[PDB]
Design a protein around this ligand. Structure first.
Ligand code: ZN
Ligand code: ZN
Ligand code: ZN
Ligand code: ZN
Ligand code: ZN
Ligand code: ZN
Ligand code: ZN
Ligand code: ZN
Lengths: 451, 451, 451, 451
């Protein structure tokens, strides 16, 4: 018989809602049918006609853990935020200590992650100066992709690469048939502008944004684009903060380049005119942009110019944020988002009419899985896929309360904001891991995913 | 129980092949499941692991019929070509006599088509000078879209519209939320060039192609594009013959315009250096282009720049073609394609490695259905869709024999060419209409489809 | 010795002001020198250090004359407006009756023009449907270029050509090495829009502008561009009214196409928010555009995107304008400009800081002469050129008084507007034809110019 | 009276040839007249109707001199090459030792240059990391512009700047209203490619070209363009070697950016398929490109896409070139060109019909002078300009003989090539400095020019 049947689902995919029931066996979708009146299942879930979507696949997560677990994030804590947030599979970036830039470091993180994570996961390897030969190694060990930075953030730990190093990395990535994602900003210009701005006595959030303007973010995007154009590797530009950058990438992919654009809920749901009340808790890199650009971004999203959405969830000890209120240059970059990503998009996007459910599923589930090659398995509900669903409730009334976060850190740029939609049940591989705010699975439940 | 079960299917969609069985009831897909070992069905079909795809949806068909049925095509004859060709639903153009440019003419064609067609169908209305108010009427009667010509072909019967008339039609179409497809060429330039070329004594197929060069085809595309840009109606440019035109449209849709590009097997599988041996049987409008352009076209197809494929199946009394061997200007335009469309794409595209099955299904099934709004119903195999499938056989060895055609006319540009892949079973709404070359259904079986 | 010496000139050319004296003999510049202290001349003019520029060459004039001289304009009257306006050579369009579309009509107009004009002149031939062979004839008789319309204005008298006819004309023009200028608008769309707008009861100036929107003007420009791209003839798009059209042409010339952009003082010095007080006296085709577009236009001018400036001077019996106040559709298109062109540019351009003298001379003297091949002779003051100068006075204070116009008609869109700069002496071929508002030469003084 | 009269000149400017005589007094053009039959001059030169053009203004010269004068070039020697080559004013780059990156270094070079140069000169200042405040100083001391490198060549002596440093330099330049020229290549990518190529055992000229491919040259151009777009300073991209780069710059200037393109006779008259016989004597940076690209370059030149031509004359001890025959990586970059620039363009451009005299004068005389603000003075022959002419002879038959060079070094990529046109008399400020191969002026004759 069947392990579980979720019935009366208004199942959503990127191209439409279909009414059916899902039959799951051995952790995967065994069948999708119009009527299950006469089939037996050990467990039965009635969706009661609510929307059911595939588990969210977040390609941009910084739980960090490892030697810095007591300062940034713990697999067993933050992965609970994912679970309640409806994010069933994450791809951990390699920014941590030790840096995931070695086969050894990689194998160790995989072992650890597998023992403490509560949702499924895939892993990135790091592409830093001088570790070129390790890339092939991590690829063979299961890494789905790699990250390189054009502008650092944690010097010594994870360094930025020069155009030549970046170019060599692009060639290796192309030869392995992997994926390379980059943080595109101009390191050198940011430094110059910081000095000019600091000298003029700027300590604002406004001063911060100006030190890393769009023209430099866009120059880096342009540069990465020109180099991929020559290397041919699949490239994803991470957290693109402005409309013009989205267009640059779109235009290029539209011309045949295997390049894609990622943005995130922080850039869509926050504006520079929130800088004053949110302060350092909104300090992220690239900077959140203007209200005017924000409008454009939302149009591009619904219209298909933004390929994927990633949270860029990443903690920072609260004591490295608070000093930012008086002097911005003393607060670190980052914002948690694992627990607020879906509800924020559902709330200000879907329930506010500026985003369709179909598109949301495309950018938060399908494309990320597709781009990394973990597709049929994650990202959709078809016969053969892992049974990763979310039963949604678009008629909720509540607020985001950062202190209730399951992650190591308890603060958020969205703290206090209203939430009108959210996943109320989330299951991975056929088992309920979170139901109405409760995680029901033990640490280690999460499996490594690849291909 | 179930009416029929097709098992061991290697089911193909635009984004991948999934292994499952299809359960159909009351003419629609009732379920898709990994295993059907213990379910009862009146009839059982074993695909034996062959590829199964949705029935092909051809948006560009000219069976014509009506008062000219004994000269161009008959619903009960040509629709049999569709059936064996794997084309389960067609959309008849309104070029016939009387012209389908009136609510009355429309209602009459629907009645007739419904009584004699063997595959399902949707209908176009015509947008000609002076019939503006009839458009709203046909829309309300179920027309899925409309056609207008920028360059005539059958003066008196179906006339070309001027930019102003075309613009007014675009506005009506936008207001109805319908679709407008156009034949884009420059009537006036073609006439001028014809005179110059005829005067120089050109009677070639080469002379023909030169009389309707790409620069004029592309100018018309550019013009239609500028007008839709202003009207906002969904626009599909029919049979685009050259790479540059495809790019123009792609660029524009890529900029936000709801415009799409259609091409067909005649333009992909035939080249001007076939002109000498095929002669007038290859004379179509727009003209088939050069071998060099042909290469580009094939790349654009696999790469996603070509949105849909339509056969542009259309007969002409064989006595209006043969005189073309000696004097090209005396042969009419047109080519049959209902029976050779899929096998030609399967043969020279899929089985020759320059086209993926996934993409083929996208341009021959999904997009056409989607663009006209008959989607979930036709174009895919999901729970709720009409059970329209094709069991394929990509390991065939045979030739196309025009004399075996089931249509009124028995000739083809592809006559004699090899066929290595073809549908071997085709069913619409759960019933086998054609099995290994035999039509098994009576005239009238076809239903009207809309929305 | 020398016939005349103009000393203490601050001589302006497109690339700078140089301080010197001009020595003229036998109607042409015989020398330019830093000091003329010891040379004898029959007559001596002291510019006293004021700016001296070449006579303005206006390529877009509609004095009309001929059988309609008592209704539109007379050579001996309007050419006096040119003289005081600083326009030393004009190129008469062929829109008149009889139409200058024949060798005979051309020879007759040349004879007449030569007997009554007071400034020098060049002539256009007409390119209308069916007169293709006359073009070669007029070219050989001295025509500098030809005009064709894509949207009519005086049906029966001068007709618009279709794309095919226009294309054939382009080929003839290329083969003769002549110039073709066109009025680019979409005839058919304008008609459709007129009907829609009239039906909704529009009788405004606003209603007028909307009936011939920019999208149709720009479509025509795009179309002409595509056809010249194929023909290779020198093309000048006349009176371009909007920024986007200027860009389209600029982009194309920038890509190697021998195409150029013309605009005029009516489009730079008038805005739609002047429509209410100026009414029908501002009704011209293409329509004057918005204030926002006006700003762009001025930038493009100073920046080099606008190649030439032409007045498009053309009268209309005042009784065909006045009824326009109540019903716009009953007023004819056109505006006088021969007497207000330079002063308007000098006043609102140069003296207002948004246009440099150097650029003004480039677009009003040099380029027009250059494009038509009458260059060294007209358009500059070099050794060998006709001595055509203007002594300017950029420190004037006065108003334009249409009733003082020397032309047949006495009204203007600029009537009442202030004038702070104007030519105060104008001479052609070494003789003063106008000095401080007085014409001093008899009818017939004007010579035919060509090459 | 007059110091000298050059009569029967067929005087050429960017827009045409005019027949006249030039009267010079006190080193400048005092008059230009059609006939000088009755004027007295101390000296009389009869051009006999040959073409007369302004002295060539070369903006890209590396005589170097200073502490390295016995190794690279001497002002009194190389300036003689300029004189016979028809180059009347040069602008010395600041790459030398000590580097011209200081007010002191600048003042010293000016003193020296003024005492030993034989043709007139202007000076560049250097923009290197850390000397930002010196720029304002050199500007005030008369520097016409500054140079910065994006890819080094002489590390330690002249360093490349990072994007931030380059950006700060752009801002200073904009604020001073000066000019900044840059060497645009990607330093870091070149290094990476060098390693890959050397490892594969490449020691070719072919191997060299591949180590600094067009994609990296063009990326740097793109980058400089984006930064100027933001800074607004006048920018000239030096020695652009390929068609695509020319287009990138052209497109940008065409969009309003004050950016310009420079190329030189080495890139137009040499091709990679000359690499084998010329070897290291053709090794320059950026590398000379392919024959196919060469064709494009020549079209762009005559068509106006290339703004200026500079020789990039620069010596290298012959012992640092010869080892290049066996191992390319051991030969230095550079090529002499002061003596072969004009004759090479005259010979393979003008006398071969692919370049007009008018355009040649525009890119070799007018624009360079204009862009640096030394215009009316240098670059043309108008009343008030320095009398700098060249009497040309386009009917010569001879070969370039590097051993006859007047410069310190005696070798050239053009050695042995035919010369069919060349200046046969060259004068600066009214005095003959070179006549038929003989320099007739003493060292120090050259004056400093500025503004
Ligand atoms: Zn980042
Ligand atoms: Zn991140
Ligand atoms: Zn057609
Ligand atoms: Zn058709
Ligand atoms: Zn007009
Ligand atoms: Zn006109
Ligand atoms: Zn250089
Ligand atoms: Zn150099």
């Amino acid at each position: 018989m069947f392990d579980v049947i979720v019935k009366n689902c208004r199942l959503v995919s990127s191209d439409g809602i279909t009414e059916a029931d899902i039959l799951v066996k051995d952790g995967k979708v065994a069948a999708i049918s119009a009527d299950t009146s006469d089939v037996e299942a050990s467990r039965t879930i009635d969706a009661g006609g609510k929307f059911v979507m595939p588990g969210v696949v977040d390609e941009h997560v910084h739980i960090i853990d490892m030697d810095l677990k007591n300062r940034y994030g713990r697999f067993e804590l933050d992965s609970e935020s994912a679970a309640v947030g409806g994010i069933t599979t994450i791809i951990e970036m390699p920014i941590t200590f030790p840096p995931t830039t070695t086969l050894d470091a990689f194998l160790e993180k995989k072992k650890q992650a597998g023992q403490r994570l509560k949702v499924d996961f895939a892993l990135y390897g790091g592409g830093v100066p001088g570790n070129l030969p390790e890339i092939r190694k991590m690829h063979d060990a299961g890494a789905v992709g790699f990250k390189s930075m054009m502008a650092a953030s944690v010097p010594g730990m994870f360094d930025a690469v020069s155009d030549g190093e970046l170019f060599e990395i692009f060639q290796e990535i192309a030869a392995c048939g992997s994926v390379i994602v980059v943080h595109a900003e101009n390191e050198t210009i940011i430094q110059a502008l910081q000095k000019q701005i600091k000298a003029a006595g700027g300590k604002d959030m406004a001063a911060y944004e100006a030190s890393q303007p769009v023209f430099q973010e866009n120059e880096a995007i342009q540069r990465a684009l020109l180099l991929q154009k020559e290397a041919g590797c699949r490239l994803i530009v991470l957290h693109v903060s402005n409309p013009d950058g989205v267009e640059l990438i779109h235009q290029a992919q539209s011309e045949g380049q295997d390049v894609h654009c990622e943005s995130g809920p922080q850039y869509l749901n926050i504006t520079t005119d929130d800088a004053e009340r949110i302060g350092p808790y909104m300090k992220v890199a690239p900077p959140v942009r203007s209200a005017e650009m924000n409008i454009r971004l939302w149009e591009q999203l619904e219209n298909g110019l933004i390929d994927t959405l990633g949270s860029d969830h990443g903690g920072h000890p609260v004591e490295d944020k608070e000093p930012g209120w008086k002097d911005v240059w003393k607060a670190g970059n980052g914002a948690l988002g694992l627990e607020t990503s879906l509800p924020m998009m559902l709330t200000n996007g879907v329930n506010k009419g500026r985003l369709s459910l179909e598109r949301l599923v495309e950018v938060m589930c399908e494309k990320p899985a597709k781009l990394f090659g973990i597709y049929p398995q994650k990202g959709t509900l078809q016969v053969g896929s892992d049974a990763d669903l979310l039963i949604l409730d678009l008629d909720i009334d509540t607020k985001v309360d950062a202190s209730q976060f399951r992650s190591l850190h308890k603060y958020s740029p969205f703290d206090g904001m209203p939430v009108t939609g959210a996943p109320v049940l989330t299951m991975v591989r056929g088992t309920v891991v979170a139901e109405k705010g409760e995680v029901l699975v033990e640490q280690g439940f999460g499996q490594f995913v690849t291909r």
